[PDB]
Amino acid sequence: SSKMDQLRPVLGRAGVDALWVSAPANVRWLSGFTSAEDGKVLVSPDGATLYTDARYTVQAQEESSLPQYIARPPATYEHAADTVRGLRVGFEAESLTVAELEDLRQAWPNSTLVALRGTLGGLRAVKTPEEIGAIRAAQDLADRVYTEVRPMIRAGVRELDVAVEIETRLRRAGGESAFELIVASGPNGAKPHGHASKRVIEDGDLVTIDMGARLGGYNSDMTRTVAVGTPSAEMKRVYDAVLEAEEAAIAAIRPGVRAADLDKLARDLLTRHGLGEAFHSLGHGVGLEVHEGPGLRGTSQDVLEAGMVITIEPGAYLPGVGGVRIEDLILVTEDGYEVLSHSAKESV
Amino acid sequence: SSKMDQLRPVLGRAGVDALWVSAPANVRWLSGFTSAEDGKVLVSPDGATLYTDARYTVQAQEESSLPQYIARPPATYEHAADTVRGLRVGFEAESLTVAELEDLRQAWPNSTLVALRGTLGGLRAVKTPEEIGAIRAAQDLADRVYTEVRPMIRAGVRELDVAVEIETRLRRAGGESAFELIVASGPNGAKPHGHASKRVIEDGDLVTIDMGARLGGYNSDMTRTVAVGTPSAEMKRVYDAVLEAEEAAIAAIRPGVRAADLDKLARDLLTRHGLGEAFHSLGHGVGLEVHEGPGLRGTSQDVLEAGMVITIEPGAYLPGVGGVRIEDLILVTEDGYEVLSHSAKESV
Ligand SMILES: [Zn+2]
Ligand SMILES: [Zn+2]
Ligand SMILES: [Zn+2]
Ligand SMILES: [Zn+2]
């Protein structure tokens, strides 16, 4: 199935005739345009057009699989107006600002603007072989940088300096850090989104490193926890249980498995090991964004299929004491899975 | 004048009784909360309240000058509903997503939601002595890092590696790069927003370095152009004219000067030196955001006053050949100006 043929049935079930595409990830997904913050796409009964300005004329001609209309707003959607006369036009209500919607409403007085909220969640969940290649390249960069920086994670080093070393190397390679880096040591490990602080790593700490590369527009995401010196018996028990949970959830990945059931497997296991209040979401899709569909929460209705790329990231957090998360990036295959993130997972 | 007493007359002239504050910069400006992406503020006839969730209970108690209501959405604006019954409630239409507006409309069925578009532009233009202190600290960091990295800007070095060296040092100091770094060498100097590429700097190039630090939530912004070796006679003429324009526009800064008239001074001067098609905006306010009010375009109606912090950044760009921009960060004083960015401006 082409990407447009994935989208149009969704729009039909949403009760709209057209879609104004404003989320940069979906502009790029549909058209191939890589400066998508400055493009928009109109999907309509007449076909699909990329709108961008004359700074991008050559780039858009080289990249876009869609015909182009070159202008700045508001000429872009005034030119579009004829195409959407009398139509129900969906828009991405979680992306579009009210001011932008007002502009469209003024431009399209004979259309009905229809808010789509979660409607396109998971639109991009199944990746093509080309997209998987770009995700592999990003994760391979992240693994290389993690391997290079790992020896530097020792007593006396600040969390922040570890983060600087990772960022430095990702940038020099032509990528960048995919999200604000987490290097969470000692009691900072109890913070699931504890961005690298000035705390000095000390003997006896666990250190949680959550990192990804964005490279060529595609993202990776992994987490490792390592010991500096000898951790407490309690923190070793926590680490072992989190690793056990991660390995069990990964081992259930296959087409047709329910995301919510993966979450249940991990929470039952953590509960069995005394951490039934310590762990939230088990993971998320990764692609043009770090966090995208599917979602691995207990309430999720998502169902995995081959070609999706997700994370599995159980964690347990003891406030004031410590915490552990271990996370891998997984490709769903036709009869199981492939782990894309290859950095070592150590004993503690 | 307190910040709230700057805001309320604006709201009165906008025809609203209250304001739902969603832009992180304005949440922080009004309340002092530093994790403002996860706070919101309701300004109303009853006073003003910061809304944030229980992850931030202690932080918000320590930081906020405003009473707090602790909950997640949608409890936050359902709790707010009683306060806005029968009122015209403004919201920030350039910040708020349509989905967020729909949520407010459902929560506040007996209020009238009123879109404010450019209404709050320049709300934060006049800085307090405390805010000026934070901007000085950010620019002082940027100047230190620029001085450290300057010798590394030589033939054989990639644009990207210069950017990495700046970023590395800003991060290790506890700040970060304020915006995607521009290191634009040779023909890349014709690109006003040419992010640092893999191009190798060579003898005979000019190199334009546009950088800022974000530190403690406040931003800086400057640009220097330097010669590596001997530039062409033409590129030297361009450099000298841009410096002349920057120094003339800066010298006109004072309370009461019109932003548009500063722009005219710079464009007339560039025109007199043969660059009347080569140069756009002359500059912008800087504070909690890199680009904020006032605006120094030919159409601007802004009028400078003491305590504003702006940039002056004339440039001339020759596609396929080269380009020059020179930019300084300026405090408006009671009878003139003070240049906050102190890095050397060199001859070429
Ligand atoms: Zn993740
Ligand atoms: Zn992660
Ligand atoms: Zn600037
Ligand atoms: Zn600048």
Side-chain angles (χ1 to χ4, degrees), chain A residues 169-204:
Chain A
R169 288 165 170 80
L170 295 177
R171 275 283 274 154
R172 204 179 289 289
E176 57 222 17
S177 180
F179 52 83
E180 194 60 52
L181 279 171
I182 295 158
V183 180
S185 71
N188 283 342
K191 313 174 183 185
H193 296 94
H195 304 140
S197 74
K198 297 182 191 180
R199 181 180 190 272
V200 174
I201 296 163
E202 295 299 347
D203 198 87

PDB file of all heavy atoms in Angstrom, chain A residues 169-204:
ATOM      1  N   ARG A 169      29.686  14.063  19.974  1.00  0.00           N
ATOM      2  CA  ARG A 169      29.960  13.041  18.969  1.00  0.00           C
ATOM      3  C   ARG A 169      28.799  12.876  17.998  1.00  0.00           C
ATOM      4  O   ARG A 169      29.025  12.693  16.797  1.00  0.00           O
ATOM      5  CB  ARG A 169      30.277  11.708  19.652  1.00  0.00           C
ATOM      6  CG  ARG A 169      31.627  11.719  20.324  1.00  0.00           C
ATOM      7  CD  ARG A 169      31.801  10.571  21.279  1.00  0.00           C
ATOM      8  NE  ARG A 169      33.207  10.516  21.703  1.00  0.00           N
ATOM      9  CZ  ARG A 169      33.750  11.300  22.635  1.00  0.00           C
ATOM     10  NH1 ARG A 169      33.008  12.203  23.274  1.00  0.00           N
ATOM     11  NH2 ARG A 169      35.045  11.189  22.912  1.00  0.00           N
ATOM     12  N   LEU A 170      27.553  12.940  18.478  1.00  0.00           N
ATOM     13  CA  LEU A 170      26.419  12.870  17.549  1.00  0.00           C
ATOM     14  C   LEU A 170      26.439  14.042  16.564  1.00  0.00           C
ATOM     15  O   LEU A 170      26.195  13.879  15.359  1.00  0.00           O
ATOM     16  CB  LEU A 170      25.097  12.875  18.309  1.00  0.00           C
ATOM     17  CG  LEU A 170      24.815  11.691  19.209  1.00  0.00           C
ATOM     18  CD1 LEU A 170      23.511  11.922  19.922  1.00  0.00           C
ATOM     19  CD2 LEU A 170      24.762  10.396  18.349  1.00  0.00           C
ATOM     20  N   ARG A 171      26.695  15.237  17.063  1.00  0.00           N
ATOM     21  CA  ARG A 171      26.762  16.396  16.165  1.00  0.00           C
ATOM     22  C   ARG A 171      27.907  16.308  15.152  1.00  0.00           C
ATOM     23  O   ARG A 171      27.729  16.653  13.964  1.00  0.00           O
ATOM     24  CB  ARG A 171      26.891  17.654  17.005  1.00  0.00           C
ATOM     25  CG  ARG A 171      25.514  18.137  17.457  1.00  0.00           C
ATOM     26  CD  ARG A 171      24.773  18.852  16.315  1.00  0.00           C
ATOM     27  NE  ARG A 171      25.107  20.276  16.213  1.00  0.00           N
ATOM     28  CZ  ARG A 171      25.037  21.013  15.090  1.00  0.00           C
ATOM     29  NH1 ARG A 171      24.669  20.474  13.928  1.00  0.00           N
ATOM     30  NH2 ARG A 171      25.347  22.317  15.118  1.00  0.00           N
ATOM     31  N   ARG A 172      29.103  15.917  15.603  1.00  0.00           N
ATOM     32  CA  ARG A 172      30.254  15.865  14.700  1.00  0.00           C
ATOM     33  C   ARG A 172      30.035  14.833  13.592  1.00  0.00           C
ATOM     34  O   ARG A 172      30.588  14.971  12.497  1.00  0.00           O
ATOM     35  CB  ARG A 172      31.506  15.533  15.507  1.00  0.00           C
ATOM     36  CG  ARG A 172      32.822  15.971  14.920  1.00  0.00           C
ATOM     37  CD  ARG A 172      34.024  15.605  15.828  1.00  0.00           C
ATOM     38  NE  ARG A 172      34.114  16.394  17.063  1.00  0.00           N
ATOM     39  CZ  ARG A 172      34.456  17.693  17.106  1.00  0.00           C
ATOM     40  NH1 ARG A 172      34.695  18.377  15.986  1.00  0.00           N
ATOM     41  NH2 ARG A 172      34.549  18.328  18.277  1.00  0.00           N
ATOM     42  N   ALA A 173      29.239  13.783  13.874  1.00  0.00           N
ATOM     43  CA  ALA A 173      28.887  12.791  12.866  1.00  0.00           C
ATOM     44  C   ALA A 173      27.825  13.283  11.890  1.00  0.00           C
ATOM     45  O   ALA A 173      27.431  12.523  11.002  1.00  0.00           O
ATOM     46  CB  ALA A 173      28.381  11.495  13.562  1.00  0.00           C
ATOM     47  N   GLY A 174      27.307  14.508  12.034  1.00  0.00           N
ATOM     48  CA  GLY A 174      26.261  14.970  11.134  1.00  0.00           C
ATOM     49  C   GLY A 174      24.840  14.704  11.593  1.00  0.00           C
ATOM     50  O   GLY A 174      23.892  14.957  10.832  1.00  0.00           O
ATOM     51  N   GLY A 175      24.664  14.166  12.790  1.00  0.00           N
ATOM     52  CA  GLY A 175      23.346  14.044  13.390  1.00  0.00           C
ATOM     53  C   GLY A 175      23.150  14.991  14.564  1.00  0.00           C
ATOM     54  O   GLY A 175      23.789  16.055  14.649  1.00  0.00           O
ATOM     55  N   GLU A 176      22.248  14.634  15.471  1.00  0.00           N
ATOM     56  CA  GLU A 176      22.114  15.382  16.713  1.00  0.00           C
ATOM     57  C   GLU A 176      21.430  14.494  17.728  1.00  0.00           C
ATOM     58  O   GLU A 176      20.870  13.450  17.387  1.00  0.00           O
ATOM     59  CB  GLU A 176      21.327  16.663  16.528  1.00  0.00           C
ATOM     60  CG  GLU A 176      19.976  16.444  15.969  1.00  0.00           C
ATOM     61  CD  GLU A 176      19.662  17.491  14.934  1.00  0.00           C
ATOM     62  OE1 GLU A 176      20.629  18.146  14.467  1.00  0.00           O
ATOM     63  OE2 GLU A 176      18.458  17.656  14.601  1.00  0.00           O
ATOM     64  N   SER A 177      21.477  14.927  18.982  1.00  0.00           N
ATOM     65  CA  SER A 177      20.705  14.246  20.013  1.00  0.00           C
ATOM     66  C   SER A 177      19.205  14.308  19.715  1.00  0.00           C
ATOM     67  O   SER A 177      18.658  15.371  19.394  1.00  0.00           O
ATOM     68  CB  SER A 177      21.025  14.872  21.375  1.00  0.00           C
ATOM     69  OG  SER A 177      20.295  14.229  22.389  1.00  0.00           O
ATOM     70  N   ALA A 178      18.525  13.155  19.812  1.00  0.00           N
ATOM     71  CA  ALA A 178      17.138  13.078  19.380  1.00  0.00           C
ATOM     72  C   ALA A 178      16.197  13.739  20.369  1.00  0.00           C
ATOM     73  O   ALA A 178      15.080  14.093  19.993  1.00  0.00           O
ATOM     74  CB  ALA A 178      16.723  11.619  19.179  1.00  0.00           C
ATOM     75  N   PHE A 179      16.617  13.872  21.626  1.00  0.00           N
ATOM     76  CA  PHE A 179      15.778  14.411  22.692  1.00  0.00           C
ATOM     77  C   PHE A 179      16.710  14.789  23.827  1.00  0.00           C
ATOM     78  O   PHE A 179      17.861  14.358  23.854  1.00  0.00           O
ATOM     79  CB  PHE A 179      14.724  13.401  23.146  1.00  0.00           C
ATOM     80  CG  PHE A 179      15.283  12.043  23.497  1.00  0.00           C
ATOM     81  CD1 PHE A 179      15.831  11.809  24.755  1.00  0.00           C
ATOM     82  CD2 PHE A 179      15.247  10.995  22.571  1.00  0.00           C
ATOM     83  CE1 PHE A 179      16.334  10.518  25.089  1.00  0.00           C
ATOM     84  CE2 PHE A 179      15.746   9.729  22.889  1.00  0.00           C
ATOM     85  CZ  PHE A 179      16.283   9.496  24.163  1.00  0.00           C
ATOM     86  N   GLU A 180      16.223  15.629  24.744  1.00  0.00           N
ATOM     87  CA  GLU A 180      17.079  16.075  25.831  1.00  0.00           C
ATOM     88  C   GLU A 180      17.641  14.861  26.582  1.00  0.00           C
ATOM     89  O   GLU A 180      16.884  14.045  27.118  1.00  0.00           O
ATOM     90  CB  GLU A 180      16.289  16.998  26.764  1.00  0.00           C
ATOM     91  CG  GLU A 180      17.143  17.804  27.744  1.00  0.00           C
ATOM     92  CD  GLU A 180      18.146  18.718  27.035  1.00  0.00           C
ATOM     93  OE1 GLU A 180      17.737  19.500  26.128  1.00  0.00           O
ATOM     94  OE2 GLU A 180      19.350  18.638  27.371  1.00  0.00           O
ATOM     95  N   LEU A 181      18.966  14.775  26.640  1.00  0.00           N
ATOM     96  CA  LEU A 181      19.661  13.589  27.132  1.00  0.00           C
ATOM     97  C   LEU A 181      19.430  13.367  28.616  1.00  0.00           C
ATOM     98  O   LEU A 181      19.471  14.308  29.412  1.00  0.00           O
ATOM     99  CB  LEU A 181      21.159  13.722  26.873  1.00  0.00           C
ATOM    100  CG  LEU A 181      21.591  13.368  25.457  1.00  0.00           C
ATOM    101  CD1 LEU A 181      23.049  13.723  25.218  1.00  0.00           C
ATOM    102  CD2 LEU A 181      21.397  11.886  25.271  1.00  0.00           C
ATOM    103  N   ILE A 182      19.214  12.102  28.985  1.00  0.00           N
ATOM    104  CA  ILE A 182      19.036  11.683  30.372  1.00  0.00           C
ATOM    105  C   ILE A 182      20.274  10.903  30.781  1.00  0.00           C
ATOM    106  O   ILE A 182      20.592   9.869  30.182  1.00  0.00           O
ATOM    107  CB  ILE A 182      17.762  10.830  30.535  1.00  0.00           C
ATOM    108  CG1 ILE A 182      16.543  11.712  30.220  1.00  0.00           C
ATOM    109  CG2 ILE A 182      17.701  10.209  31.941  1.00  0.00           C
ATOM    110  CD1 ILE A 182      15.291  10.966  29.822  1.00  0.00           C
ATOM    111  N   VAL A 183      20.996  11.421  31.775  1.00  0.00           N
ATOM    112  CA  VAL A 183      22.082  10.712  32.429  1.00  0.00           C
ATOM    113  C   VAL A 183      21.770  10.852  33.914  1.00  0.00           C
ATOM    114  O   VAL A 183      22.001  11.910  34.502  1.00  0.00           O
ATOM    115  CB  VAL A 183      23.463  11.283  32.084  1.00  0.00           C
ATOM    116  CG1 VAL A 183      24.565  10.477  32.800  1.00  0.00           C
ATOM    117  CG2 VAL A 183      23.662  11.334  30.544  1.00  0.00           C
ATOM    118  N   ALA A 184      21.156   9.821  34.498  1.00  0.00           N
ATOM    119  CA  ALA A 184      20.535   9.952  35.809  1.00  0.00           C
ATOM    120  C   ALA A 184      21.262   8.998  36.745  1.00  0.00           C
ATOM    121  O   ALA A 184      21.154   7.774  36.585  1.00  0.00           O
ATOM    122  CB  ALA A 184      19.039   9.630  35.722  1.00  0.00           C
ATOM    123  N   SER A 185      22.011   9.557  37.703  1.00  0.00           N
ATOM    124  CA  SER A 185      22.893   8.795  38.577  1.00  0.00           C
ATOM    125  C   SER A 185      22.418   8.855  40.030  1.00  0.00           C
ATOM    126  O   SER A 185      21.882   9.867  40.486  1.00  0.00           O
ATOM    127  CB  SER A 185      24.335   9.327  38.467  1.00  0.00           C
ATOM    128  OG  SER A 185      24.440  10.603  39.086  1.00  0.00           O
ATOM    129  N   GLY A 186      22.646   7.767  40.767  1.00  0.00           N
ATOM    130  CA  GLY A 186      22.271   7.717  42.164  1.00  0.00           C
ATOM    131  C   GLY A 186      20.794   8.006  42.329  1.00  0.00           C
ATOM    132  O   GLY A 186      19.960   7.497  41.581  1.00  0.00           O
ATOM    133  N   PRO A 187      20.442   8.834  43.316  1.00  0.00           N
ATOM    134  CA  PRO A 187      19.026   9.193  43.511  1.00  0.00           C
ATOM    135  C   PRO A 187      18.392   9.855  42.302  1.00  0.00           C
ATOM    136  O   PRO A 187      17.165   9.805  42.162  1.00  0.00           O
ATOM    137  CB  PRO A 187      19.063  10.160  44.710  1.00  0.00           C
ATOM    138  CG  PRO A 187      20.385   9.953  45.330  1.00  0.00           C
ATOM    139  CD  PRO A 187      21.325   9.532  44.263  1.00  0.00           C
ATOM    140  N   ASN A 188      19.174  10.481  41.416  1.00  0.00           N
ATOM    141  CA  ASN A 188      18.576  11.015  40.192  1.00  0.00           C
ATOM    142  C   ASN A 188      17.959   9.919  39.321  1.00  0.00           C
ATOM    143  O   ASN A 188      17.100  10.222  38.488  1.00  0.00           O
ATOM    144  CB  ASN A 188      19.619  11.800  39.390  1.00  0.00           C
ATOM    145  CG  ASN A 188      19.878  13.172  39.989  1.00  0.00           C
ATOM    146  OD1 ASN A 188      19.073  13.655  40.777  1.00  0.00           O
ATOM    147  ND2 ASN A 188      20.987  13.815  39.601  1.00  0.00           N
ATOM    148  N   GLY A 189      18.375   8.663  39.498  1.00  0.00           N
ATOM    149  CA  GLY A 189      17.769   7.572  38.758  1.00  0.00           C
ATOM    150  C   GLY A 189      16.302   7.364  39.082  1.00  0.00           C
ATOM    151  O   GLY A 189      15.601   6.688  38.328  1.00  0.00           O
ATOM    152  N   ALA A 190      15.812   7.942  40.182  1.00  0.00           N
ATOM    153  CA  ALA A 190      14.382   7.863  40.460  1.00  0.00           C
ATOM    154  C   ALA A 190      13.554   8.784  39.564  1.00  0.00           C
ATOM    155  O   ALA A 190      12.320   8.680  39.569  1.00  0.00           O
ATOM    156  CB  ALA A 190      14.128   8.177  41.938  1.00  0.00           C
ATOM    157  N   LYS A 191      14.196   9.651  38.762  1.00  0.00           N
ATOM    158  CA  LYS A 191      13.472  10.587  37.902  1.00  0.00           C
ATOM    159  C   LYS A 191      13.415  10.046  36.475  1.00  0.00           C
ATOM    160  O   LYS A 191      14.452  10.040  35.791  1.00  0.00           O
ATOM    161  CB  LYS A 191      14.166  11.953  37.919  1.00  0.00           C
ATOM    162  CG  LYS A 191      14.530  12.458  39.310  1.00  0.00           C
ATOM    163  CD  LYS A 191      15.359  13.760  39.261  1.00  0.00           C
ATOM    164  CE  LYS A 191      15.773  14.182  40.676  1.00  0.00           C
ATOM    165  NZ  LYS A 191      16.473  15.504  40.686  1.00  0.00           N
ATOM    166  N   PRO A 192      12.249   9.629  35.965  1.00  0.00           N
ATOM    167  CA  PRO A 192      12.224   8.984  34.638  1.00  0.00           C
ATOM    168  C   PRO A 192      12.629   9.910  33.512  1.00  0.00           C
ATOM    169  O   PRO A 192      13.092   9.423  32.478  1.00  0.00           O
ATOM    170  CB  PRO A 192      10.760   8.526  34.485  1.00  0.00           C
ATOM    171  CG  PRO A 192      10.196   8.519  35.893  1.00  0.00           C
ATOM    172  CD  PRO A 192      10.912   9.650  36.587  1.00  0.00           C
ATOM    173  N   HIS A 193      12.464  11.224  33.679  1.00  0.00           N
ATOM    174  CA  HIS A 193      12.874  12.201  32.674  1.00  0.00           C
ATOM    175  C   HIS A 193      13.855  13.203  33.275  1.00  0.00           C
ATOM    176  O   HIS A 193      13.863  14.394  32.933  1.00  0.00           O
ATOM    177  CB  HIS A 193      11.652  12.883  32.056  1.00  0.00           C
ATOM    178  CG  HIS A 193      10.775  11.931  31.303  1.00  0.00           C
ATOM    179  ND1 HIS A 193       9.678  11.319  31.874  1.00  0.00           N
ATOM    180  CD2 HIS A 193      10.878  11.425  30.051  1.00  0.00           C
ATOM    181  CE1 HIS A 193       9.122  10.504  30.995  1.00  0.00           C
ATOM    182  NE2 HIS A 193       9.831  10.546  29.882  1.00  0.00           N
ATOM    183  N   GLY A 194      14.727  12.698  34.146  1.00  0.00           N
ATOM    184  CA  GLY A 194      15.785  13.478  34.766  1.00  0.00           C
ATOM    185  C   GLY A 194      16.920  13.867  33.836  1.00  0.00           C
ATOM    186  O   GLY A 194      17.928  13.154  33.712  1.00  0.00           O
ATOM    187  N   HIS A 195      16.797  15.031  33.218  1.00  0.00           N
ATOM    188  CA  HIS A 195      17.835  15.481  32.300  1.00  0.00           C
ATOM    189  C   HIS A 195      19.185  15.631  33.008  1.00  0.00           C
ATOM    190  O   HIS A 195      19.260  15.929  34.201  1.00  0.00           O
ATOM    191  CB  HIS A 195      17.376  16.776  31.641  1.00  0.00           C
ATOM    192  CG  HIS A 195      16.050  16.625  30.957  1.00  0.00           C
ATOM    193  ND1 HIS A 195      15.067  17.589  30.996  1.00  0.00           N
ATOM    194  CD2 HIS A 195      15.540  15.595  30.234  1.00  0.00           C
ATOM    195  CE1 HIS A 195      14.015  17.168  30.312  1.00  0.00           C
ATOM    196  NE2 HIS A 195      14.272  15.957  29.850  1.00  0.00           N
ATOM    197  N   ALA A 196      20.259  15.360  32.268  1.00  0.00           N
ATOM    198  CA  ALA A 196      21.590  15.297  32.864  1.00  0.00           C
ATOM    199  C   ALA A 196      21.878  16.555  33.679  1.00  0.00           C
ATOM    200  O   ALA A 196      21.732  17.690  33.187  1.00  0.00           O
ATOM    201  CB  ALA A 196      22.648  15.095  31.772  1.00  0.00           C
ATOM    202  N   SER A 197      22.232  16.351  34.950  1.00  0.00           N
ATOM    203  CA  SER A 197      22.476  17.447  35.880  1.00  0.00           C
ATOM    204  C   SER A 197      23.976  17.601  36.121  1.00  0.00           C
ATOM    205  O   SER A 197      24.806  16.906  35.526  1.00  0.00           O
ATOM    206  CB  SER A 197      21.731  17.214  37.209  1.00  0.00           C
ATOM    207  OG  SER A 197      22.365  16.221  37.980  1.00  0.00           O
ATOM    208  N   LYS A 198      24.331  18.496  37.048  1.00  0.00           N
ATOM    209  CA  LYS A 198      25.734  18.643  37.412  1.00  0.00           C
ATOM    210  C   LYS A 198      26.170  17.660  38.487  1.00  0.00           C
ATOM    211  O   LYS A 198      27.328  17.715  38.916  1.00  0.00           O
ATOM    212  CB  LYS A 198      26.024  20.083  37.865  1.00  0.00           C
ATOM    213  CG  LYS A 198      25.791  21.083  36.736  1.00  0.00           C
ATOM    214  CD  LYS A 198      26.131  22.519  37.148  1.00  0.00           C
ATOM    215  CE  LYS A 198      25.627  23.504  36.078  1.00  0.00           C
ATOM    216  NZ  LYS A 198      25.946  24.918  36.448  1.00  0.00           N
ATOM    217  N   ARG A 199      25.288  16.749  38.907  1.00  0.00           N
ATOM    218  CA  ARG A 199      25.647  15.780  39.940  1.00  0.00           C
ATOM    219  C   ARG A 199      26.852  14.949  39.500  1.00  0.00           C
ATOM    220  O   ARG A 199      26.932  14.490  38.352  1.00  0.00           O
ATOM    221  CB  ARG A 199      24.445  14.852  40.245  1.00  0.00           C
ATOM    222  CG  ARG A 199      24.779  13.819  41.346  1.00  0.00           C
ATOM    223  CD  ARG A 199      23.625  12.864  41.706  1.00  0.00           C
ATOM    224  NE  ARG A 199      23.978  12.086  42.918  1.00  0.00           N
ATOM    225  CZ  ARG A 199      24.641  10.935  42.892  1.00  0.00           C
ATOM    226  NH1 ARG A 199      25.030  10.398  41.747  1.00  0.00           N
ATOM    227  NH2 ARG A 199      24.928  10.312  44.021  1.00  0.00           N
ATOM    228  N   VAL A 200      27.789  14.745  40.412  1.00  0.00           N
ATOM    229  CA  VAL A 200      28.971  13.937  40.125  1.00  0.00           C
ATOM    230  C   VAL A 200      28.659  12.468  40.410  1.00  0.00           C
ATOM    231  O   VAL A 200      28.184  12.114  41.501  1.00  0.00           O
ATOM    232  CB  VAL A 200      30.191  14.439  40.925  1.00  0.00           C
ATOM    233  CG1 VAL A 200      31.409  13.515  40.741  1.00  0.00           C
ATOM    234  CG2 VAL A 200      30.568  15.846  40.473  1.00  0.00           C
ATOM    235  N   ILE A 201      28.883  11.623  39.400  1.00  0.00           N
ATOM    236  CA  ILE A 201      28.736  10.175  39.560  1.00  0.00           C
ATOM    237  C   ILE A 201      29.720   9.674  40.606  1.00  0.00           C
ATOM    238  O   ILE A 201      30.900  10.042  40.596  1.00  0.00           O
ATOM    239  CB  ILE A 201      28.970   9.477  38.211  1.00  0.00           C
ATOM    240  CG1 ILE A 201      27.901   9.884  37.199  1.00  0.00           C
ATOM    241  CG2 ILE A 201      28.967   7.947  38.371  1.00  0.00           C
ATOM    242  CD1 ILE A 201      28.293   9.573  35.772  1.00  0.00           C
ATOM    243  N   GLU A 202      29.247   8.810  41.515  1.00  0.00           N
ATOM    244  CA  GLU A 202      30.105   8.311  42.576  1.00  0.00           C
ATOM    245  C   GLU A 202      30.022   6.799  42.644  1.00  0.00           C
ATOM    246  O   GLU A 202      29.061   6.175  42.177  1.00  0.00           O
ATOM    247  CB  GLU A 202      29.757   8.913  43.949  1.00  0.00           C
ATOM    248  CG  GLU A 202      29.978  10.436  44.075  1.00  0.00           C
ATOM    249  CD  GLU A 202      31.435  10.903  43.861  1.00  0.00           C
ATOM    250  OE1 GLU A 202      32.373  10.074  43.852  1.00  0.00           O
ATOM    251  OE2 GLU A 202      31.653  12.127  43.674  1.00  0.00           O
ATOM    252  N   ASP A 203      31.072   6.220  43.213  1.00  0.00           N
ATOM    253  CA  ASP A 203      31.123   4.784  43.418  1.00  0.00           C
ATOM    254  C   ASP A 203      29.892   4.298  44.175  1.00  0.00           C
ATOM    255  O   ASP A 203      29.460   4.907  45.157  1.00  0.00           O
ATOM    256  CB  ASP A 203      32.381   4.438  44.192  1.00  0.00           C
ATOM    257  CG  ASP A 203      32.723   3.007  44.062  1.00  0.00           C
ATOM    258  OD1 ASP A 203      33.431   2.704  43.064  1.00  0.00           O
ATOM    259  OD2 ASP A 203      32.257   2.209  44.909  1.00  0.00           O
ATOM    260  N   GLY A 204      29.328   3.185  43.727  1.00  0.00           N
ATOM    261  CA  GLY A 204      28.088   2.712  44.293  1.00  0.00           C
ATOM    262  C   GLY A 204      26.827   3.152  43.561  1.00  0.00           C
ATOM    263  O   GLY A 204      25.749   2.608  43.841  1.00  0.00           O
TER     264      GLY A 204
END
